[PDB]
Amino acid sequence: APTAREENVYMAKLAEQAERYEEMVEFMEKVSNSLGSEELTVEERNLLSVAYKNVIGARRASWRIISSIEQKEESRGNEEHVNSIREYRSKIENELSKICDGILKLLDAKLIPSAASGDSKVFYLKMKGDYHRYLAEFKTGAERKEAAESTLTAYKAAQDIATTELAPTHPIRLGLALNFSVFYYEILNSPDRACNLAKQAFDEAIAELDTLGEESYKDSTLIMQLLRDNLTLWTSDMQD
């Protein structure tokens, strides 16, 4: 008979196919809270991150829509709609704060103390950077500073390991550079250090591809397109 861990992993993949990512999250958390000294397999670790990226991702999209609407109704001085919109937004933000705190507790409690290779250390620290950065995207004032500070500590810990342990062409490292640069551009409003970081990750990858090739080419070339996309539209905005 299969173990609970096997059946939770199987349910999670059923949850992903039915597109019920909340329950996908719950199943993958049962797997994580059942760990001893060992760490998640690449597969389970990617199932956890896909679950959470899709739960948070639906709220982020909702937040963005409700924010743009509120910015329009502010533009007309239509306060009653504005107050309704903001109660709605505040509710979406309460979910964002809960989803983030779920994964962020897991990461510090189970996942990061189990990481045993460079691959997973970077993977979990970058995911800690990511979810502190989703908080930053909507927090204001004192709360925003704390998020941004947490984000920067996590991404820099990730990158100290990534640049010393993974190849320039590794998708988790390229993904880290991609997000770290986005954090400089959109949270810290620093286009100078966004481009320096993004373009340096791209150039070290190109250099490795030109001399050594790489394995898992599929994933990296697309993140590399992402890097180049953000770069060419960041640098058109500095000029334009």
């Binding site: 963005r64 990511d130 998708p171 390229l174 993904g175 880290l176 991609l178 997000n179 986005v182 551009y185 959109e186 993140i223 992402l226 996309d229 953000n230 539209l233």
Partner: peptide, 5 residues
């Protein structure tokens, strides 16, 4: 809103 991994 920019591209992120």
């Amino acid at each position: 809103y920019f591209s992120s991994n």
